[PDB]
Amino acid sequence: PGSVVELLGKSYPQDDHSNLTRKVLTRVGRNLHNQQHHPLWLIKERVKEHFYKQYVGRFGTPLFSVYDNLSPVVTTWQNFDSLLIPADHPSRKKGDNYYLNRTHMLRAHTSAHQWDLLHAGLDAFLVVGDVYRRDQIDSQHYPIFHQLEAVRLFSKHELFAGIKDGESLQLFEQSSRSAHKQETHTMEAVKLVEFDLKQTLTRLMAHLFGDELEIRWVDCYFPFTHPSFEMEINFHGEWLEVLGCGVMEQQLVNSAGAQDRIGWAFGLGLERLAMILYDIPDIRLFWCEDERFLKQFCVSNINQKVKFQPLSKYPAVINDISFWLPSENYAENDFYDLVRTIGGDLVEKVDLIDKFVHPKTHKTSHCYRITYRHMERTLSQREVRHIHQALQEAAVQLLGVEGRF
Ligand SMILES: N[C@@H](Cc1cccc(O)c1)C(=O)O
């Protein structure tokens, strides 16, 4: 680690929270979602088209202003507080986030920009960006991914525009929160906003995958919406969630300066959708510069349905690695970072196969299985060996583990 961190021309005093690895710094600024012909970019464009064309189609729909080049550096106030996330909420753990320090971090979700954009008076906007999270390692997790956010506000008169005695209906009231609504909302209002959310997302999803796909709404919870849903798509026989969404917490919308609006919001994972839409097997492919992959996304128009042709799958080399955790100083995600650093994209997955306490010493023992498998070629036993030992050493030097091997 170190003393100061310097990012995009700015300086961050380091502290008890800071945990940014250099490997990750190097991805910042890369902006794949603004990269012409990259699948993430393509999805972004297609989503953008849907809203503009949905903005011409009907007098209802507003203009969504699009922000796809905001800096991923934000304050914990933006990323958490402004979205009502309690101080003790697990999503804040040092072990799950990349903190430049106590006050700044790499945003963990594009929702970190809602308050700012809404405070700026906006009513409908999209945000698209690289987000950052310390998580596990497998073909479906990567420390960096991309999200597309959408917020849409409604005025009273707009929401109830199409009815008889309309203006006698309201957005607000003071009842109690239930499973179906916030305390300061009318069920009349919540029902129409929720309908609008689902319909938009459904039309959109249907734009992207045609009238073929199986979706389902799932009731869930987020501190910044209520009610909230995850939308799942069935793919390869499994219900995968591809987005979060719901009716915006009114205190959020009020603290931004629009106490007269009711809104929905959603956040969708670009990679997660891309992998389903194009049958892309491993998240790592988004970052490889192999033409066998990238070329397949060069199309004349963003609607020219691409036919993703899987690359060959190469053989893996598997190596276990065990060791003793420092005396109460350790995070599983610490190790996964070290594996990202040393093994880079050579690593396909890391499983924590074994854990146990030694009676005599009270020390704890972790054993992990590392699957080395390169997306573009056969890995030689020799190269894996070297990498694996380097990992072994590094583990000891940096993580203060005792090489049990
Ligand atoms: N920010 C959440 C997804 C989400 C949920 C609800 C509303 C949003 O606008 C976005 C996440 O990253 O998981």
Swiss-Prot record:
It is found in: Mitochondrion matrix; Mitochondrion. One of its GO terms (cellular component) is mitochondrion. InterPro entries: aa-tRNA-synth_II (IPR006195), aa-tRNA-synth_II/BPL/LPL (IPR045864), Fdx_antiC-bd (IPR005121), Fdx_antiC-bd_sf (IPR036690), Phe-tRNA-synth_IIc_mito (IPR004530), Phenylalanyl-tRNA_Synthase (IPR002319). Its EC number is 6.1.1.20. It catalyses: tRNA(Phe) + L-phenylalanine + ATP = L-phenylalanyl-tRNA(Phe) + AMP + diphosphate + H(+). Signal peptide: none annotated. GO terms for molecular function: ATP binding; phenylalanine-tRNA ligase activity; tRNA binding. It holds the Pfam family FDX-ACB. GO terms for biological process: phenylalanyl-tRNA aminoacylation; tRNA aminoacylation for protein translation; tRNA processing. Keywords: Acetylation, Aminoacyl-tRNA synthetase, ATP-binding, Disease variant, Hereditary spastic paraplegia, Ligase, Mitochondrion, Neurodegeneration, Nucleotide-binding, Primary mitochondrial disease, Protein biosynthesis, Transit peptide. Residues 312-404 form the FDX-ACB domain. The modification N6-acetyllysine is found at K156. Gene3D superfamilies: Bira Bifunctional Protein, Domain 2, Ferrodoxin-fold anticodon-binding domain. Belongs to the class-II aminoacyl-tRNA synthetase family. It is linked to Combined oxidative phosphorylation deficiency 14: A severe multisystemic autosomal recessive disorder characterized by neonatal onset of global developmental delay, refractory seizures, and lactic acidosis. Biochemical studies show deficiencies of multiple mitochondrial respiratory enzymes. Spastic paraplegia 77, autosomal recessive: A form of spastic paraplegia, a neurodegenerative disorder characterized by a slow, gradual, progressive weakness and spasticity of the lower limbs. Rate of progression and the severity of symptoms are quite variable. Initial symptoms may include difficulty with balance, weakness and stiffness in the legs, muscle spasms, and dragging the toes when walking. In some forms of the disorder, bladder symptoms (such as incontinence) may appear, or the weakness and stiffness may spread to other parts of the body. Monomer. Is responsible for the charging of tRNA(Phe) with phenylalanine in mitochondrial translation. To a lesser extent, also catalyzes direct attachment of m-Tyr (an oxidized version of Phe) to tRNA(Phe), thereby opening the way for delivery of the misacylated tRNA to the ribosome and incorporation of ROS-damaged amino acid into proteins. This is Phenylalanine--tRNA ligase, mitochondrial.
